Design a protein around this ligand. Sequence first.
Ligand code: HEB
Ligand code: CYN
Length: 123
Amino acid sequence: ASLYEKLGGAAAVDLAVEKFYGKVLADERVNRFFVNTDMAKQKQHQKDFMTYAFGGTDRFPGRSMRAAHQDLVENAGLTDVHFDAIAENLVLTLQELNVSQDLIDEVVTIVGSVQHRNDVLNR
Ligand code: HEB
Ligand SMILES: [C-]#N
């Protein structure tokens, strides 16, 4: 079925997003971007987005990646080194949880891609 399902569905995704943001909040390279962010709500939005991205829901939720991040590009100096850190954090999350490499590579095809980078970084 969906990648979402093979990952273990709503509760696994929830877990991974929690673990993911633990790392992000503990990562000096990027954590300043969330210093004013309501994190329960961010985790919810991130769980929404991934639930869709992994084929678990039938319509794009919330803001486009480009629009969600345009302010950080314009004001907060967001760029490659920040993108790389976020994607590396996500992969570390799934590796530590020992998700199979097949499934992680698939995830990375979505969240590591140049497509996503260029949306986020507004290029
Ligand atoms: C690519 C790895 C990437 C994804 C998939 C992503 C996801 C989100 C989502 C779903 C939101 C909320 C969207 C909505 O409002 O509906 C979102 C907002 C924020 N992001 Fe990211 N993000 C990705 C990439 C990055 C990188 C790199 C960042 C560097 C720190 C980063 C940060 C943030 C922040 C601060 C917000 C909040 C913006 C706000 O309005 O509060 N994101 N992102
Ligand atoms: C963006 N988390």
